[PDB]
Design a protein around this ligand. Structure first.
Ligand SMILES: O=P(O)(O)OC[C@H]1O[C@H](OP(=O)(O)OP(=O)(O)O)[C@H](O)[C@@H]1O
Ligand SMILES: O=P(O)(O)OC[C@H]1O[C@H](OP(=O)(O)OP(=O)(O)O)[C@H](O)[C@@H]1O
Ligand code: HPA
Ligand code: HPA
Ligand SMILES: [Mg+2]
Ligand SMILES: [Mg+2]
Lengths: 174, 179
């Protein structure tokens, strides 16, 4: 099955850097990658029809899926970057993730008020990163339709921190 | 010009003195935001690589982080897997790393020791070539794994910084060139 093609390509590294779920094998197997993008695209098409304006990809591992998913849906991809990386006027927000702290940034002209966005990242843990991205999109007055990822770590309850924003993952681990 | 190249060129913006005085920053963000532009970029790079290597590529290597924006899409377009070369400290398991200089700083790149087997054929992709330091480091790590680096490609090339000369004799190709 398609989902199995993705599932078979997650490898785990205990005690890095925590059981680190490595998405690398998904990228390295063209069949696995196409299955992951296809499943995500199919989901978003079915759930939001044609109400999506842009995909937003989260620096850095989110960059691996964002543009491909956007392309599969005939949509542009906007970039939400680690602070200090984007040129021109920006907004930023600080946050905590599973194994540290960071800050995200977005260009002020990335989106206009009301525009509809789906945020994509590789993996959802505590939900801190995804929430910060939602906060930034919020300051631009964009509407966040949904957040999605390849992997979700259910024990960390990231889904709860995003509620009531819908969240969808292809794979779940405790 | 090729109408396809024009869809990419018209979506590059410039910012003076970011992130430090003297740098003219080429912002690729509009290319990603315009699906037609992004689509053209990937197609142009794929077409070049098919014509130049006749399908004899095993993997595309994408360079953290703006290289990640093009690597997987290009790989997919070619029916290929994409391997990651990351900023040091980000990849799990046994790794190799190398220090380098880029146009406006210095850093360290890293690759997993099992990313590639000896003799496997790779093309490296990044968003922009400036001094060539980043791509050179990637090539150095790929060489440690005994990978054959066939070519390096980017969307943008800043010709005054002579990055291409630093990569020689590894072939290089860019869609767009600016001084
Ligand atoms: O749900 P959370 O607890 O926020 O964790 C999830 C985030 O952590 C990782 O990013 P990281 O900051 O390691 O940077 P990277 O994307 O460059 O690996 C991962 O790629 C997610 O973005
Ligand atoms: O030819 P060079 O002089 O090495 O410069 C080009 C490199 O520098 C930039 O990366 P940066 O280190 O800014 O990180 P990013 O990819 O995360 O933006 C750019 O994305 C290239 O990777
Ligand atoms: O446990 C994890 N595994 C992989 N990536 C991550 N990003 C945040 N937490 C994790
Ligand atoms: O001048 C630049 N612009 C954009 N990205 C870059 N990465 C290195 N130099 C540059
Ligand atoms: Mg991340
Ligand atoms: Mg870079």
């Amino acid at each position: 099955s398609e989902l199995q093609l993705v599932e078979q390509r997650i490898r785990s590294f205990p005690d890095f850097p925590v059981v680190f779920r490595d998405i690398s094998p998904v990228l390295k197997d063209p069949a696995s990658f196409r299955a992951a993008i296809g499943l995500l695209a199919r989901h978003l098409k079915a759930t939001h029809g044609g109400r999506i304006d842009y995909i937003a990809g989260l620096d850095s591992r989110g960059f691996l899926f964002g543009p491909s998913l956007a392309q599969e849906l005939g949509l542009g991809c906007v970039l939400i970057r680690k602070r200090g990386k984007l040129p021109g006027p920006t907004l930023w927000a600080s946050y905590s993730l599973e194994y540290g702290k960071a800050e995200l940034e977005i260009q002020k002209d990335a989106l206009e008020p009301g525009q509809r966005v789906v945020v994509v990242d590789d993996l959802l843990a505590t939900g801190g990163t995804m929430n910060a991205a939602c906060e930034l999109l919020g300051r631009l007055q964009a509407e966040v339709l949904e957040c999605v990822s390849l992997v979700e770590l259910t024990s960390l309850k990231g889904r709860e921190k995003l509620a009531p924003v819908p969240f969808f993952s292809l794979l779940q681990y405790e």
